């Protein structure tokens, strides 16, 4: 689990969005596994606007942060799950690192701010949904 809180927005994995996220919906995209809802309180986080390909992510299944090198946002085939049929997920960045079911939502950060959130895993890999292109999160 986990979310990004920036301005009056809350960014979560679309497959983990709550009834309240959907009732306050701003934008969602199944192909990216992202959903953004509106909040009444002002959020804590800063979004990176950069092309970093190294950073640090939080892994809840180990209660620890790990440094990672990750691929540029791209279209990657993701196997069927209880949440989605087998499909290509866009704007996804892969890295070698630990991730289990339950780790989705962990934040990936570089020196410029938040880069994205854990969205895929297994096989000693961890995939992150990029948010750096969502320029409207800041205005
Ligand atoms: C975190 N993952 C994981 C880790 C170890 C072992 C098995 C898994 C599966 C899970 C996974 O990749 N998912 C499931 C939930 C929806 C995600 C999506 N963006 O489509 C895909
Ligand atoms: Zn950066």
Swiss-Prot record:
Q: Where does Zn(2+) 1 bind?
A: 50, 52, 110, 112
The positions flagged as active site in the entry are 15, 33, 104
Q: Which domain of life is it from?
A: Viruses
- UniProt catalytic activity: Selective cleavage of Tyr-|-Gly bond in the picornavirus polyprotein
Q: What does this protein do?
A: Cysteine protease that cleaves viral polyprotein and specific host proteins. It is responsible for the autocatalytic cleavage between the P1 and P2 regions, which is the first cleavage occurring in the polyprotein. Also cleaves the host translation initiation factor EIF4G1, in order to shut down the capped cellular mRNA translation. Inhibits the host nucleus-cytoplasm protein and RNA trafficking by cleaving host members of the nuclear pores. Counteracts stress granule formation probably by antagonizing its assembly or promoting its dissassembly.
Could you give the subunit structure recorded for this chain?
Answer: Homodimer.
Q: What is this protein called?
A: Protease 2A
Q: What's the source species for this entry?
A: Coxsackievirus A16 (strain G-10)
The organism's taxonomy opens as:
Viruses, Riboviria, Orthornavirae, Pisuviricota, Pisoniviricetes
Q: Which residues of the full protein are shown?
A: 869 to 1007 of 2193
């Amino acid at each position: 689990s986990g979310a990004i809180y920036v301005g009056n927005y809350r960014v979560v994995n679309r497959h983990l969005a709550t009834h309240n996220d959907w009732a306050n919906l701003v934008w969602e995209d199944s192909s990216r596994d992202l959903l953004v809802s509106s909040t009444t309180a002002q959020g804590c986080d800063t979004i990176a606007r950069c092309d970093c390909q190294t950073g640090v992510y939080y892994c809840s299944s180990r209660r620890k942060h790990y440094p990672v090198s990750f691929s540029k946002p791209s279209l990657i085939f993701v196997e069927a799950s209880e949440y989605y049929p087998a499909r290509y997920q866009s704007h996804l960045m892969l890295a070698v690192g630990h991730s289990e079911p339950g780790d989705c939502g962990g934040i990936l950060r570089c020196q410029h701010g938040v880069v994205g959130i854990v969205s895929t895993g297994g096989n000693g890999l961890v995939g992150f949904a990029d948010v750096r292109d969502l320029l409207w999160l800041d205005e």
